[PDB]
Ligand binder design. Structure first.
Ligand SMILES: Cc1ccc2nc(C)c(-c3cc4nc(N5CCCC5)cc(NC5CCOCC5)n4n3)nc2c1
Ligand SMILES: [Mg+2]
Ligand SMILES: [Zn+2]
Length: 302
């Protein structure tokens, strides 16, 4: 891989660039550095094909989330098993499979068939189900050299991690982790605690846009709102007044909305993550920097 990417990929704030045909080799590099090479590529290409041309929750997003996981895992050597590392990187690549740019709330209000099938964490459950189906295509079982027991195990890791990208679950998960940390009861050798930490890692990776340098973070914000505002339109088509976040009428309040989001979700997230895994600190610093940028925008300086 290019010398610059070889080096810069180790940075938390790395951007994977605009060349799509480079991203598979970035993922393969990361996952080799953290498989049957033919099956892997085959698997990656099918996953890519199941992603949609939507502004934010797309193929680029998936590799970006996977990269963040890579960086966390590299800077916390010895904490997670070889399996967990494989499962988590795959989970990240697959977590938004078949995303159509709408939230679980809209699918519910639309009375989408997936909401009858999966009452809770609707999209996330469907994404895992899609992932399993891709794995079950001829020549796509990247876990073929594992035993059945380890196969079942890695799928379980993947399922929980994908489900954890439902931001509705973040709030209780992080609250529980925070109290475990502050009381000294947090035990990484406890599987249930360990699952929670992985959940928070998944949230941290999924939101990692907010931990890039400002020019990246600033531009990506256009992508998330393009999805959010289209959902607000569809909500209005259902005869339902959307929440401000998804109302394009309220686009002038975007800086204030971002402030809200960083204060309520993103800062607490990386703060807790940094407490549990100190080497993730750069994610929190970059997040804090971006919060400061949004504050300057509101002052009319940016
Ligand atoms: C990069 C990234 C990734 C995920 C994100 N998820 C959310 C939910 C948000 C987000 C956006 C937003 N916009 C808001 N408004 C814009 C104009 C009116 C309000 C408001 C919010 N969140 C408020 C925070 C407190 O509860 C009320 C909603 N968010 N969040 N940003 C993300 C950014
Ligand atoms: Mg998602
Ligand atoms: Zn995502």
């Amino acid at each position: 891989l290019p010398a610059r990417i070889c080096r810069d990929i180790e940075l938390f704030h790395f951007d994977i660039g605009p060349f799509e045909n480079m991203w598979p080799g970035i993922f393969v590099y990361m996952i080799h550095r953290s498989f049957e090479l033919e099956k892997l590529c085959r698997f990656i290409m099918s996953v890519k094909k199941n992603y949609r041309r939507v502004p934010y929750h797309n193929w680029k997003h998936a590799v970006t989330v996977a990269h963040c996981m890579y960086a966390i895992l590299q800077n916390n050597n010895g904490l997670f098993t070889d399996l967990e590392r494989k499962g988590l990187l795959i989970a990240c690549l697959c977590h938004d499979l078949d995303h159509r740019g709408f939230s679980n709330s809209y699918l519910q209000k639309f009375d989408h068939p997936l909401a009858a099938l999966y009452s809770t964490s609707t999209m996330e459950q469907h994404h895992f189900s899609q992932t399993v189906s891709i794995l079950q295509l001829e020549g796509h079982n990247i876990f073929s050299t594992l035993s059945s027991s380890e196969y079942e195990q890695v799928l379980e890791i993947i399922r929980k991690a994908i489900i954890a990208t439902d931001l509705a679950l973040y709030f209780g998960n992080r609250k529980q982790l925070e109290e475990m940390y502050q009381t000294g009861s947090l035990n990484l050798h406890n599987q249930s605690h360990r699952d929670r930490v992985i959940g928070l890692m998944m949230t941290a990776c999924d939101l990692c846009s907010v931990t890039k340098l400002w020019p990246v973070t600033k531009l990506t914000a256009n992508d998330i709102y393009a999805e959010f505002w289209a959902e607000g339109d569809e909500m209005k088509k259902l005869g339902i007044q959307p929440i401000p976040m998804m109302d394009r009428d309220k686009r002038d309040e975007v800086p204030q909305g971002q402030l809200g989001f960083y204060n309520a979700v993103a800062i607490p997230c990386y703060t807790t993550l940094t407490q549990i895994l100190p080497p993730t600190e750069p994610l929190l610093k970059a997040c804090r920097d971006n919060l400061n940028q949004w504050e300057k925008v509101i002052r009319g300086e940016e």
